[PDB]
Amino acid sequence: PIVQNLQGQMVHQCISPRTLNAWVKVVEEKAFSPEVIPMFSALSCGATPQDLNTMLNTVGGHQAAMQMLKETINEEAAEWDRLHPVPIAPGQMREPRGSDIAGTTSTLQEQIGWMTHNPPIPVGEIYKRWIILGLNKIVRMYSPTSILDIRQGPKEPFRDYVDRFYKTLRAEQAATETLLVQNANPDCKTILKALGPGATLEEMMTACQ
Amino acid sequence: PIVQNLQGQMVHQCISPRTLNAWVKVVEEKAFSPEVIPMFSALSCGATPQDLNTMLNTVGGHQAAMQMLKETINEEAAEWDRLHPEPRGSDIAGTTSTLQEQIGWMTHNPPIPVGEIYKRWIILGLNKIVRMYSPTSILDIRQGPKEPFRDYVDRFYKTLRAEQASQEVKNAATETLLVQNANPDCKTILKALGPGATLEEMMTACQ
């Protein structure tokens, strides 16, 4: 990544063994569960495009996802190119083509230049935004359950049900105003209605203990 | 490795106990699976030739692989001496070069990346090793009758990764072999999707 040192200038630092292993373990243990994305984003805080490619490349397996990801990077990069056409003035840096943000056609020094420039050209944060967009698509393709299939079991505690409800709703990415109450236990459903519309989830959940 | 300090100057640092075991454990856990190469490259960030040799020498076992790697290093260095009749191939490979000669070359202006050059050679031999150890051909990946399309695409591009040709062969593979070797239930949908369909659309179509 590009970090701030002690004399206040943005300097390049090697990706640590710990971040590298942390990203590999999160993919191994949690594959593409929705919460691996913010973990990725945090593990790649300050990353250069080069760093992001390292992180993606250390992944063994998930090559369907990894290819789906490459195809998203293409669409976002081509869209950058169609919207940001690209000699250079002395003070300035050359302009980043779509392939440069993805790190295929830019050197690490060019990346460090773009990111440590004033004003900064955040090729890492842009690249990340593309990758996270691809990751979010993978999360929703791999979501196993539809929101319409979550109904509270007869012996199932209401919390366990609300858990299942917002967990699946998270993976799919409003349509849940009355979807939660309508698909609740016959006994809890009337209790929720006796509270009336506008009850808080705390009020709903204490009500069906 | 040569890292940047807090005053903006490239200084030599000792390889950390954490980088060392990170490298030793990746090799112990993974018999030169394709993803070991990018781990090595990351673990060797800023590495000097000496460091690269340290990382390699810590590998216990896989001595067939290590012996092949040495021969690739030989050839790449032997070729360096022809293109270059100053660092000789043996200096970049760290056999005849001192740490201080190495630190000097790397902090020169203009820099002479003997670390990146040696790494370039090592990565090249390692890629030879993954190809030799690649277990399956791309032509043997066929979607099972009850195999979900996702799991098949996983097998397809995982295999394609280890049997690394040039993207002409890789794209000739994708634009024919993936769709051709799907089970006939999902396969007919792929033609109905049309040849230009994206991977994401194909997978939703067979979910």
Binding site: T104, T105 | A173
Partner: peptide, 13 residues
């Protein structure tokens, strides 16, 4: 076509 199918991330063409 920044990345072609089967090519690693960041690989120079």
């Amino acid at each position: 076509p920044v990345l072609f199918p089967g090519q690693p991330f960041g690989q120079p063409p």
